């Protein structure tokens, strides 16, 4: 504490199963070694590391991450302490922990021990936390502690010389709360004196002093303990185990931690994917396997679509699909703004290992793309940067899938390098005339828009001022953001003839008119070959 | 380990397309594809047989051009050889029949307490013994009283190793937890004996064992005062002794025991397949472009002919070239033609001989002449053809002469022609026609012509595609699209990929949702005939 | 039909014979 010095818009969210972190919490990762302190194995992390790299030139913003498993902290309740660990799950049953009585101290020491990170560091002299000395002629001088009796918390410290109490130290009246206070104010005695431990910043408090009553004392230089609390200052603010007091703390062996457990594989989502609902994450991955759990998925969107809040939801289905299989989630989950993903393939991961990858994970590397594109720009024939995929499927068998609505992998020939690029912004959705429905890019720029629109609407005319506000004027401000929002080209076109407002009482009714920007998706060519004359 | 200089005398070998084989041969996992760069890497992935020898002939058949990186797959269901015998399953790492002569025993040492494990296979002249198996580490007690033990009891769920305990009498000394804890590698136990006051652990010297501490087996009281016993774990002691070298792998069905020196069994190539289609998916998406099987059947030459024209319409273009029989007539030629008449085909006819590397003056059909000449078609840069270029080969099996290399070659099927002295080989291919009917059309007709546009097209495509089929918006009329192409002809014409083109006869048409391009290119191709006339003034 | 690459005036009128094209149009 001293000062010194030492050596995109569109948030994305993932969601599934993997080893560390609290249960039902929402983590705002932002690196790489963020998300390896926070989880340590499972597809999850792989998502993570997958969306900040699946293409080098355009990558995912902010991640919110969520471990989704019923998690226990593993606990063992020995000597005097409820031992707790910090990591919940199975994991945590590799944790030691012991305490070891230490002679030349007369002390406890600790050793935890936990075998992944090899953690293994000690913390020593625990108690001991300051001497005390006589020097005068009495030959009778102690010392003792007094405890309030309905907690067994110190209310006196007292010293006593000559056979007879000298003075007081009022453990809730002052400044000492502070165990310094009573070091301090010895030090002005004419012969009484004390010294802080040579071991530390310890300055506990008062309040954590153990029992101890007629500690003889005058040429000595005898300590006083307070161990539950030297164990909270000078090590539960550290590493990964947890100590709370029940019964007093004494030694005990090297001993694993037990009971960290996940619990069963999760039946619903949705009460957990309520974490979302204002954080506002626009594209989100669930990395989940079945086909229930996607349809919870497609009922939160639904409900976050109702409520005002654009969503999208990005998935996958298994391994080795077939056309009719994925058919048959296709019309099982038909609502527009969940898009659904064919293949899966393998990826090059951090370890430089070949790693097998499910469509509910390669549905990651689609959504780590889709957040890094500037808004309104279409997925489209960007590259996608996949070491191996079950990509057997056609030209026409692209354009089958594609026609149905589902989003398809491709591969293309450089002419000497190769890479894979998807074909297609389609979502799930039916109709081929609604682009706002039917196209991903096309539904965000309707949906970022309408985000704004909204909101100026409230602001000028929730404003309630009067009824007096006729319908002409909506028809002018309609004008102004039309406009406005052709100035930043976000449309390419509108009639401005074509607004028309009603009014009746408190209600309006709004109709207008906007050419969206239109798109160049097919080119045809046609190629011949001449005979050519060259001559001397 | 320490700081040193190291020279290795590598015998590798004894550059841009890729070229796919499918054949058999008598080694090798099958049904997944390999990428081989070296000569000296395919001998000890493969062994024996026309997929290796088609290979070693690829990579030599012209003296200063060769093949580039080469795939393979293997055309056989090759089991490999196993057996149990004694509580172990015994599997090779080799699939086939050449894996039955493998050989594997064990034998118990009195002087050790533990086994002699001894692996033989012949033709790779392999026979080396791994001893001491177990022995991992040893306790002697040191405490006076009378007789002191140790214990090491399983996980009785899943008979791993739980705990190791130490017992003077009936007291529990120390004891430790091997499920995973501290002790995950067995260091951190080499330690937290030794430094107890009444006990002394150490390691054998034969290696750096340091195994994974749930691999030790049942004890139970085994003195240690009057002898320094050992701790055992025999079973997960083999990865350690042999599993990153050599033939053989292990696994646990069960007790470890002793056994004669005993054959493997099972090793099987199978029947070869009746079909090729199935594992010819496979070269899909493996980034291919020449592609040859090594076998003379018709239904294998009918199955890649129609393989190639279903990656043609999938944006991947490939060429096959095929050949067929020991020395085939004009009859049975053009009956194979008439059969396969699709472009981006060619048929071999001749059966040469080869100067095999080995000495082995090798008669070799026509399939793998083909290979010979796709392997050096391939290598070439783009554009170049086969037309009047010479073969390293030795001698051919051969009807057809000067006439019949009128028939044969107007016909669309290739075929060598030998040319007395001087020109390097005596032999030279004569032309580079496919096996499409019509000749008219040079980019069906002429394979060269064709392997020129094939990569020219993918270009224009690719660079089309992130400039316009991106969608980035419709303002950018069809003017622009000329100035777009005309700058990419003009590096064509530059950069010598085409002949010549004419810049102001290019015509564009847009509806908004689609654009219509249309362009001339003259073309640059091999000379192939030259009318040089003499006049004088007498 | 997914995205793709495939690969005056004074207007003049004639009317005369021909081997195709739907005639009266």
Sequence with gaps: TRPHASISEKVFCLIGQAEGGEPNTVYELRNYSQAKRLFRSGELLDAIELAWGSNPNYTAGRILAMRIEDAKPASAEIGGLKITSKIYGNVANNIQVGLEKNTLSDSLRLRVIFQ?????????????????????????????????????????????????????????????????????????????????????????????????????????????????????????????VSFEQLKTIEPFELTKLKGGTNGEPPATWADKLDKFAHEGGYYIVPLSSKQSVHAEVASFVKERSDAGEPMRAIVGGGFNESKEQLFGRQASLSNPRVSLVANSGTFVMDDGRK??????????????????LEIGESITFKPLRVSSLDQIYESIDLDELNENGIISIEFVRNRTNTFFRIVDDVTTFNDKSDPVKAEMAVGEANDFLVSELKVQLEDQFIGTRTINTSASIIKDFIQSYLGRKKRDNEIQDFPAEDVQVIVEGNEARISMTVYPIRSFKKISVSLVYKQQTLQA
């Design 116 to 240: 992944d990170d090899r953690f293994n560091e000690v913390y020593d002299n625990i108690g001991n936390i300051f001497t005390i000395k006589y020097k005068g002629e009495e030959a009778n001088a102690t010392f003792s502690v007094e405890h309030d009796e309905e907690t067994q918390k110190a209310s006196r410290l007292v010293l006593k010389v000559g056979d007879q109490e000298v003075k007081s130290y009022d453990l809730t009246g002052g400044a000492y709360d502070y165990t310094n206070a009573i070091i301090t104010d010895i030090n002005q005695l004419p012969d009484f004196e004390a010294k802080l431990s040579p071991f530390g910043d310890k300055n506990l408090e008062s309040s954590k002093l153990d029992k101890i009553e007629n500690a003889n004392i005058k040429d000595k230089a005898v300590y006083v303990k307070a161990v539950f609390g030297d164990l909270e200052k000078q090590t539960a603010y550290n590493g990964i």
């Design 355 to 372: 790693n097998h990858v499910p469509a509910y994970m390669v549905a990651v590397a689609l959504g780590g793309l889709a957040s890094g």
